[PDB]
């Protein structure tokens, strides 16, 4: 143990110091938000402003981290290992960023996602305030209860994805698909002219999507495209006017296929499984509350 | 009873053997997923790869099934009848697939959906792991509680489908429908020119849908089309910009008809009935939990 | 009291007779569904089929109703008044329909909605089966608990409708509205050419909707149009890509107006009020369950 | 204390007077709704009708407010301070409106939003009826429980907004983006012609939105645009066909980026956080119920 270690150790655990560090983290988060709001462009207008702001923030976080570790003899195995190592990693990215700002590009351009970790510094605030810590800890201790129903969901999702790839990966492949009208029975056009050639019971409809793909190739082209499309349907986004209805009305008289496909998928997965997963998640959280 | 039946019977019930079978089922599921991901095309690139992979998987499932039945004297009436018959059906489709791969096409091309059962082999895993078994068993024992509210929902859905077919099956039949502006009273154009012929209070807008049908013919053309459209509205997908609003603004001054139709339908069915059904489902499941 | 009244009274209350009447109601419902499915057209193909099917169904309902009332001395004030009067009204519509089918059109063509009541005959089944009766009775006894939160919802909805009519009823009135690009700062085009005239920071984008109206005139043209649009947003249908975003990006730098409008509306009404109303509804129903 | 103060004080607290005031507030709300329904236009048809209706309503509210304050000696600090000051502010805007209607425009045209407060007069009714008061008071006393989970939500939302601005603010910047087909492997076109130049495994599809902006510039152009787009995704509106899928299929083989982005965002924020916030809100309200 260092001679002046205990004093600084209890100094860092002071409520005022903790609130000052929390204010520093929130100020850094607001600095990042302001950078992305008023100057996110490739040709940045106030460039050194954010550069040196990040420099100062990482320097202050370094000094406060060194204060934190000097009270624990640089050990960080015995006391709050997870938060200390998370702090370590973010300060390390900070030192890496400052070193790059000082002495050129010492890193390949293939690790920008690691530099991106500065946005996750606000997670340090969750240790500063007890209520947010309680909520995130409850979420973490409730996820394992979710796990089983979640894996049931993903199993059923992959089943439906296999079925969808096998059925509709070939749909609208020419780029246009044919739907069949019922004009003569509805009386819009006489039966004589349909045979005679003035009108037809079969219009041709383009299957190309907003992304340029055909319907099958995009929605159910491969297994992972199918799984993503089924996730879209699970959330409930545009499952009919884009995903379901073209396939439903592709089947001239076999329409029961697509309707049963999407109806059973929606009912089982969305209604039953989503509500079950949310129920077990919330149940575990409130059981942890008391 | 066979002489060496008890030994193999307790051998199959070994935890290690059960986990090996579970790994086999999961590996087969991953094999199917990989087949549908990296090579789902009609002109398959690695054709024999999936063919012989399925061959080996069905062979191994056959050997393990024979091990299972030899411990029960090939009886499968007294011990776990449902799981045994499900296993039997899947192996049977597997042996059928191997026989077709070996000695030509012994089946008509009208039973591909029966070959499709290989995707449902992962349901065998649910017997291997106790938690997934608990969840699926609870779902099965909670469905009968759902049944009554579900049939109330479908009764009301069919009522609204009859009403919708009777009302809107004729809507936008020419392919274009007329909505009436209110420009003069809003001051956009003077009242003199509207009578004089420079501007008009009635623009004509197409009713044709993305599927090529008119609005009435597709959404409420027949009773089953109407029921599907009402299911779409029940899930909440695009009920306004595609289903409701053209019918709402078709009525010049009788707009109360469509608005009350869709508003009452949404409120009653979606809100009340969906939440009631989910509540009773989840209530039955958690009552089965403890 | 009639001499042979008690015998027929206890005869109608027989479980077998009740189930036969329930089968009759379900068969009539299926007949209506089949009529709307296989022949809903204006030029009906099998016309007398449905005409005489309805004839026979109304005749049988008349005979069974007369059996019901003869056991209560045609009184129907003292015993099950509500169900008896509902039965009366549906059988009356049935006799009216049969009288029209027999002796011409004795009614003006302005009362087809009264003839439409045949679709609601299935509600008679709810008295036949006890579980459906329990569910509908619980819904009826839980609606008054909903009433207060529902009126709070509609009050807030009308407030937001007044605000929306006052703000956006004039939006996109020319039919096209101008959104402002930020190309120069983003570096897409140099600042010299924008002043010089090669490129512009503003583009005019059409405000006309799928119904032919402008954005303001349709969504918030009048108070009732605004209330309907806010109901659409409350359900969550296309509130952004159609309702919100054009108004949000109409404001060049005053974008906080529309964003705060729709964000506060969605949060308060949809999340808070919808979940509160559903919670109180379900709470009342389950409190009635036990 | 005034000589005749107690009599009028207990007179205003009479149930009949309270119900008359409630009827007055509801009538004013209906008057505003009727004004916005039958005559919201800039060129109002019945102009003096609403002008003098508001005049009379503000006059009556003034007389009743003076009755209220005369019983409390014009003090309004000791007895029901919040409701009294809210009443004060609305009458003040009412007297301001009457003064403007009488003696010209004494206000700059920059304070119409303050005149807009007449729509919020219906909030006075909530004090008249006890049940609505109970519900709004419970909402107010449950909001602080929401606060912590709400700030966690907004923190995560801003994190994802920073990430989205950094990633996709440059997406579809030319106005068109390139998605890559897989036609040769699907058998749609031979591999010879793709190299030879008859067909291409790429297509260029426009990135411009309905608002005239490109995809990146509108959805994630700035931090606040990104936060609004993430709120749209949180509500679940068109997150795939407009927000996610163009970015997902922009990545040729790096598609895991956008899919993981939006999938993790939806799961965590929407499912977990929305359900947690609603659960804690409703829990606090029902804990306040009993």
């Amino acid at each position: 143990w260092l001679p002046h270690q205990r004093k600084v150790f209890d100094f860092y655990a002071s409520q005022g110091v903790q609130y000052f560090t929390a204010f520093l983290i929130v100020s850094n988060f607001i600095f990042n938000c302001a950078e992305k709001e008023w100057d996110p462009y490739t040709d940045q207008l106030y460039q050194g402003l954010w550069r040196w702001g990040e420099f100062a923030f990482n320097t202050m976080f370094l000094i406060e981290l060194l204060i934190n570790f000097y009270g624990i003899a640089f050990c960080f195995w015995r006391y709050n290992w997870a938060w200390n190592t998370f702090d370590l990693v973010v300060v390390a990215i900070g030192t890496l960023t400052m070193a790059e700002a000082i002495g050129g590009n010492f890193m390949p351009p293939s690790m920008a996602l690691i530099r991106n970790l500065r946005a996750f510094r606000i997670f340090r605030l969750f240790k500063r305030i007890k209520s947010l810590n309680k909520i995130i800890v409850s979420l973490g201790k409730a996820i394992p209860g979710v796990a089983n129903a979640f894996v049931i969901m993903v199993i059923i999702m992959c089943i439906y994805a296999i079925l969808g790839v096998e059925f509709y990966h070939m749909t609208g492949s020419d780029g246009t698909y044919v739907t069949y009208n019922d004009n003569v029975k509805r009386g819009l056009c006489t039966g004589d002219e349909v045979e005679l050639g003035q009108c037809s019971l079969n219009q041709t409809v383009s299957s190309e999507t907003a992304r340029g793909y055909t319907y099958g190739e995009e929605y159910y082209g491969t297994f992972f495209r199918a799984l993503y499309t089924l996730f879209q349907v699970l959330t409930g986004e545009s499952w009919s006017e884009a995903v379901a209805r073209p396939a439903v009305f592709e089947s001239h008289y076999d329409s029961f296929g697509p309707v049963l496909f999407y109806v059973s998928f929606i009912i089982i997965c969305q209604i039953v499984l989503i509500n079950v997963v949310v129920a077990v998640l919330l149940d575990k959280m409130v059981e942890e509350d008391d | 009873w066979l002489p060496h039946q008890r030994k193999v019977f307790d051998f199959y019930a070994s935890q290690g053997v059960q986990y090996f079978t579970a790994f086999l089922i999961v590996s087969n599921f991953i094999f199917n997923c990989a087949e549908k991901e990296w090579d789902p095309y009609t002109d398959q690139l690695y054709q024999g790869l999936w063919r012989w992979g399925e061959f080996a998987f069905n062979t191994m499932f056959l050997i393990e099934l024979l091990i299972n039945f030899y411990g029960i004297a090939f009886c499968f009436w007294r011990y776990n009848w449902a799981w045994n018959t499900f296993d039997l059906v899947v192996v049977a489709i597997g042996t059928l697939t191997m026989a077709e791969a070996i000695g030509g096409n012994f089946m008509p091309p009208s039973m591909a959906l029966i070959r499709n059962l290989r995707a449902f082999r992962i349901f065998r895993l649910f017997k291997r792991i106790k938690s997934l078994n608990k969840i699926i068993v609870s779902l099965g024992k909670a469905i009968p509680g759902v049944a009554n509210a579900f049939v109330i929902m479908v009764i009301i859905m069919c009522i609204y489908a009859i009403l919708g077919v009777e009302f809107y099956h004729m809507t936008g039949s020419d392919g274009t429908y007329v909505t009436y502006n209110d420009n003069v009273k809003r001051g956009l154009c003077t009242g003199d020119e509207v009578e004089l012929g420079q501007c008009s209070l009635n623009q004509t807008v197409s009713s044709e849908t993305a599927r090529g049908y008119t609005y009435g013919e597709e959404y409420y053309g027949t009773f089953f089309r109407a029921l599907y459209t009402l299911f779409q509205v029940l899930t909440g997908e695009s009920w306004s910009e595609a289903v409701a609003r053209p019918a709402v603004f078709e009525s010049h001054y009788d707009s109360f008809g469509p608005v009350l139709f869709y508003v009452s339908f949404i409120i009653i069915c979606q809100i009340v009935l969906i939440n009631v059904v989910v509540a009773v489902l989840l209530d039955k499941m958690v009552e089965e939990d403890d | 009291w009639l001499p042979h009244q008690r015998k027929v009274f206890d005869f109608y209350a027989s479980q077998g007779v009740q189930y036969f009447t329930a089968f009759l109601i379900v068969s009539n419902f299926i007949f209506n569904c089949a009529e709307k499915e296989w022949d809903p057209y204006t030029d009906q193909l099998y016309q007398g089929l449905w005409r005489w099917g309805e004839f026979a169904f109304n005749t049988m309902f008349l005979i069974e109703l007369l059996i019901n009332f003869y056991g209560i001395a045609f009184c129907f004030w003292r015993y099950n008044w509500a169900w008896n009067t509902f039965d009366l009204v549906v059988v009356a519509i049935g006799t009216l329909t049969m009288a029209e089918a027999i002796g011409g059109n004795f009614m003006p063509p302005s009362m087809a909605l009264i003839r439409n009541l045949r679709a609601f005959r299935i509600f008679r089944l709810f008295k036949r089966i006890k579980s459906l009766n329990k569910i509908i009775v619980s819904l009826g006894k839980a609606i008054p608990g909903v009433a207060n939160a529902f009126v709070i919802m509609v009050i807030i909805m009308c407030i937001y409708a007044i605000l929306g009519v006052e703000f956006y009823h004039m939006t996109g009135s020319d039919g096209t509205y101008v959104t402002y690009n930020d190309n120069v700062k983003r570096g897409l085009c140099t600042g010299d050419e924008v002043e010089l005239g090669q490129c512009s920071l503003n583009q005019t984008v059409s405000s006309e909707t799928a119904r032919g109206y402008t954005y303001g005139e349709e969504y918030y043209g009048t108070f009732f149009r605004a209330l309907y649009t806010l109901f659409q947003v409350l359900t969550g249908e296309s509130w952004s890509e159609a309702v919100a975003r054009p108004a949000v990006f109409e404001s060049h730098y005053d974008s906080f107006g529309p964003v705060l409008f729709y964000v506060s509306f969605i949060i308060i009404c949809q999340i808070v009020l919808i979940n509160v109303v559903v919670a109180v509804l379900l709470d009342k129903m389950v409190e009635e369950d036990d | 204390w005034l000589p005749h103060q107690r009599k009028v004080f207990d007179f205003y607290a009479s149930q009949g007077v309270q119900y008359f005031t409630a009827f007055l507030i509801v009538s004013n709300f209906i008057f505003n709704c009727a004004e916005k329904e039958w005559d919201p236009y800039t060129d109002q048809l019945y102009q003096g009708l609403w002008r003098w209706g508001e005049f009379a309503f503000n006059t009556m509210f003034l007389i009743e407010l003076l009755i209220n304050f005369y019983g409390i000696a014009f003090c309004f600090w000791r007895y029901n301070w919040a409701w009294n000051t809210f009443d004060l502010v609305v009458v003040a805007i009412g007297t301001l409106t009457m003064a403007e209607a009488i003696g010209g425009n004494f206000m700059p045209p920059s304070m119409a939003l303050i005149r807009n407060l007449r729509a919020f007069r219906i909030f006075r009714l909530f004090k008249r009826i006890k049940s609505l008061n109970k519900i709004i008071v419970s909402l107010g006393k449950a909001i602080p429980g929401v606060a912590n989970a709400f700030v966690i939500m907004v923190i995560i939302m801003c994190i994802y907004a920073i990430l989205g601005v950094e990633f996709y603010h440059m997406t579809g910047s030319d106005g068109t983006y390139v998605t890559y087909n897989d036609n040769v492997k699907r058998g749609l076109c031979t591999g010879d012609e793709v190299e030879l130049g008859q067909c291409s495994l790429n297509q260029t599809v426009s990135s411009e939105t309905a608002r005239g902006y490109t995809y990146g510039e509108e959805y994630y152009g700035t931090f606040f645009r990104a936060l609004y787009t993430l709120f749209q995704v949180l509500t679940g509106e068109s997150w795939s066909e407009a927000v996610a899928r163009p970015a997902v299929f922009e990545s040729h083989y790096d598609s895991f980026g956008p899919v993981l982005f939006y999938v993790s965002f939806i799961i965590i924020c929407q499912i977990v956080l929305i359900n947690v916030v609603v659960a804690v809100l409703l829990d606090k309200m029902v804990e306040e119920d009993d």
Binding site: N275, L282, D283 | N275 | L282 | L282
Partner: peptide
């Protein structure tokens, strides 16, 4: 619904614990 349904559950076991 699970948000709604669980909230009503919180009252069932709270009532259940009260009697027990």
């Amino acid at each position: 619904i699970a948000a709604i349904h669980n909230a009503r559950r919180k009252k069932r076991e709270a009532a259940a614990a009260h009697k027990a």
